[PDB]
């Protein structure tokens, strides 16, 4: 199963998401991340 990533509409960094989730909102921000260690725009983007 592929790794899904979502782009923060503010900082444009890509954040990994767990497999479970379609049904994302139209706009998405780091602050919405289920992973609490990647939940603001200051955290660097994880390497691919």
């Amino acid at each position: 199963p592929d790794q899904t990533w979502v782009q923060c509409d503010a900082c444009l960094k890509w954040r990994k998401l767990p497999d479970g989730m379609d049904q994302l909102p139209e706009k998405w921000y780091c602050s919405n991340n289920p992973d609490p260690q990647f939940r603001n725009c200051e955290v660097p983007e994880e390497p691919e």
Binding site: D2, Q3, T4, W5, V6, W14, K27, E48
Partner: peptide, 8 residues
Amino acid sequence: ARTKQTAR
């Protein structure tokens, strides 16, 4: 939201 997919 804008998404992408990469192979594991």
